[PDB]
From a paper:
Light-oxygen-voltage ([name]) flavoproteins belong to the Per-ARNT-Sim (PAS) domain superfamily sharing the canonical PAS protein fold. Widely distributed in multiple kingdoms of life, [name] proteins control a number of cellular responses like phototropism, chloroplast movement, stomatal opening, regulation of circadian rhythms, photo-induced growth patterns and pigment synthesis. They function specifically as photosensory modules, typically binding a blue light absorbing flavin chromophore (FMN, flavin mononucleotide; FAD, flavin adenine dinucleotide or RF, riboflavin). Light absorption results in the formation of a metastable covalent bond between the C4a atom of the flavin ring and the sulfur of the neighboring cysteine residue.
Crystallization setups were performed with both 10% and 50% FMN-loaded protein, where both protein preparations yielded tetragonal crystals within a week that were colorless, indicating absence of chromophore. In the corresponding electron density maps, no density could be assigned to the flavin chromophores FMN or RF. Each monomer comprises a [name] core domain (aa 17–118) that shows a typical α/β PAS fold, and two helical elements at the N- (aa 1–13) and the C-terminus (aa 120–133 in chain A/120–136 in chain B). The apo-state [name] structure displays significant conformational differences compared to its FMN-containing homolog PpSB1-[name] around the chromophore pocket as illustrated by the superposition of the two structures. The photoactive C53 shows a different rotamer conformation, with the Sγ atom facing away from the chromophore pocket. In the [name] apo-state, the residues involved in hydrogen bond interactions with the chromophore in PpSB1-[name] point away from the pocket or form intramolecular interactions, as seen for the key residues Q116, N95 and N85.
Author numbering:
A (entry chain B): -9 to 137
B (entry chain A): 1 to 134
The structure:
Amino acid sequence: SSGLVPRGSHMINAQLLQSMVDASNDGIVVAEQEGDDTILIYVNPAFERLTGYSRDEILYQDCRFLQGDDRDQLARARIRKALAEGRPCREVLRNYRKDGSAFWNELSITPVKCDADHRTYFIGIQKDVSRQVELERELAEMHVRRN
Amino acid sequence: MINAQLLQSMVDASNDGIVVAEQEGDDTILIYVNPAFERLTGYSRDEILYQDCRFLQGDDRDQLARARIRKALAEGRPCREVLRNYRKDGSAFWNELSITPVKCDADHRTYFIGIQKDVSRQVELERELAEMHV
Ligand SMILES: [Cl-]
Ligand SMILES: [Cl-]
């Protein structure tokens, strides 16, 4: 049974948390709900590196800027629903970079209530799946080629 | 310019494992672990914390890579490696591990941030593909 001793170092501080977020390989954004729209108030470097948009053209603009795919229209809709209800959700989407090139990404959204200011914020995690998708497709082709 | 609770939630929601470690003598001691790291390795936070990084069983095929990591850590340098590791239950996973040094002169010591991304599916798909060409 777990009678484990509770552990965590109280040496950890907000400076180290910011470095974890800066070092994260996945993109990490924070968003707020202003009326009917979703506004990005924080983005980490990975988000820039994956999407090609800078922090400053993104910040405090509606997230509609990241161009979606029509094959994802249903998933897009599931996301807005969960956002309105403050429920979490996860979806794999084909999105478009600033230069219009496509990337596949798994997007996972967690709502969080802030203790200092009582308002509801949502945390996105943006995982590039492009390489997994591309490998799975090559394998599918080779199955047609070989077998 | 961002709340300290919100950063923690960012780290907690992460899919990748995120740890902090500090050098202690000959050891690199893990002082923080996020939930994804618990799930990736199969160990709970309280069984991981304050143990040397070698608690997580490695592969003999990685001995060279581990040596590079030791060197980078001793020198306070970042490094990145793909390793085969084994969970608490003994199942294997491939993971890309990226280490970022951070100096706190406040603490008079260098902290290390690992990012541990499970690459297992990428590795096995790549291996299947290698066969299909034979
Ligand atoms: Cl739409
Ligand atoms: Cl494509």
